[PDB]
Design a protein around this motif. Structure first.
Motif, PDB file in Angstrom:
ATOM      1  N   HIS A  35       0.804  -1.225   0.000  1.00 32.03           N
ATOM      2  CA  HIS A  35       0.000   0.000   0.000  1.00 32.03           C
ATOM      3  C   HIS A  35       0.839   1.278   0.000  1.00 32.03           C
ATOM      4  O   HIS A  35       0.348   2.305  -0.465  1.00 32.03           O
ATOM      5  N   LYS A  36       2.056   1.260   0.559  1.00 32.24           N
ATOM      6  CA  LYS A  36       2.941   2.448   0.800  1.00 32.24           C
ATOM      7  C   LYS A  36       2.325   3.595   1.630  1.00 32.24           C
ATOM      8  O   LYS A  36       2.130   4.738   1.141  1.00 32.24           O
ATOM      9  N   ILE A  37       2.083   3.293   2.898  1.00 36.93           N
ATOM     10  CA  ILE A  37       1.484   4.265   3.841  1.00 36.93           C
ATOM     11  C   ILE A  37       2.513   4.872   4.729  1.00 36.93           C
ATOM     12  O   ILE A  37       3.086   4.219   5.647  1.00 36.93           O
ATOM     13  N   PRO A  38       2.799   6.177   4.548  1.00 40.58           N
ATOM     14  CA  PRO A  38       3.782   6.780   5.425  1.00 40.58           C
ATOM     15  C   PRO A  38       3.306   6.875   6.881  1.00 40.58           C
ATOM     16  O   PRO A  38       2.130   6.953   7.138  1.00 40.58           O
ATOM     17  N   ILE A  39       4.218   6.965   7.807  1.00 40.13           N
ATOM     18  CA  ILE A  39       3.885   7.219   9.220  1.00 40.13           C
ATOM     19  C   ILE A  39       3.065   8.479   9.357  1.00 40.13           C
ATOM     20  O   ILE A  39       2.174   8.516  10.205  1.00 40.13           O
ATOM     21  N   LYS A  40       3.334   9.503   8.536  1.00 36.54           N
ATOM     22  CA  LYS A  40       2.512  10.725   8.575  1.00 36.54           C
ATOM     23  C   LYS A  40       1.045  10.330   8.389  1.00 36.54           C
ATOM     24  O   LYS A  40       0.146  11.040   8.978  1.00 36.54           O
ATOM     25  N   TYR A  41       0.760   9.339   7.537  1.00 38.69           N
ATOM     26  CA  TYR A  41      -0.664   8.954   7.315  1.00 38.69           C
ATOM     27  C   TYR A  41      -1.246   8.219   8.501  1.00 38.69           C
ATOM     28  O   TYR A  41      -2.424   8.384   8.799  1.00 38.69           O
ATOM     29  N   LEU A  42      -0.382   7.477   9.203  1.00 40.74           N
ATOM     30  CA  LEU A  42      -0.835   6.787  10.414  1.00 40.74           C
ATOM     31  C   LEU A  42      -1.108   7.864  11.452  1.00 40.74           C
ATOM     32  O   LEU A  42      -2.005   7.728  12.319  1.00 40.74           O
TER      33      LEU A  42
END
Length: 154
Positions: free
Chosen positions: A98-105
């Motif tokens: 998916h490529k989810i950055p920590i910023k998105y978490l």
């Protein structure tokens, strides 16, 4: 970082209320995420075309997604920090597929807190919000450590 048992109980008390209607809570949380950080919606191929909150509310695929995320998160919270097994497959899929950055978490944690604060002032006063923040920070910290093991800068 380590939560106290008292901290976990504040987390789990409010979670019990979420669980009265996980689908409704998931719709509110994903809508809040997608409204607050529209870029996050782009990650979701099945429903990234949705244009409005009304469209979001009516989407069966978005409702199913919200159940998925919250159920997974719920299982993690119930481990009270002992969540290495649950985090492993999640970190790999979010890092590599998916490529989810920590910023998105961080953005979804914000959305969770927002919705809980709005829906559950009976169980989400300042101490409970502090405990849930601590729980979500723990989660994000452990995910970030796994992203690094996996080769993803996050």
């Amino acid at each position: 970082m380590v939560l106290s048992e008292g901290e976990w109980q504040l987390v789990l008390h409010v979670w019990a209320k979420v669980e009265a209607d996980v689908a409704g809570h998931g719709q509110d949380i994903l809508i809040r995420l997608f409204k607050s950080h529209p870029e996050t919606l782009e990650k979701f191929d099945r429903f990234k075309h949705l244009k409005t909150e009304a469209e979001m509310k009516a989407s069966e695929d978005l409702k199913k997604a919200g159940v998925t995320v919250l159920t997974a998160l719920g299982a993690i919270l119930k481990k009270k920090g002992h969540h290495e097994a649950e985090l492993k497959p999640l970190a790999q899929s979010h890092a590599t597929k998916h490529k989810i950055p920590i910023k998105y978490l961080e953005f979804i944690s914000e959305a969770i807190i927002h919705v809980l604060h709005s829906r559950h002032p009976g169980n989400f006063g300042a101490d409970a919000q502090g405990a849930m923040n601590k729980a979500l920070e723990l989660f994000r910290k452990d995910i970030a450590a796994k992203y690094k093991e996996l080769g993803y800068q996050g």
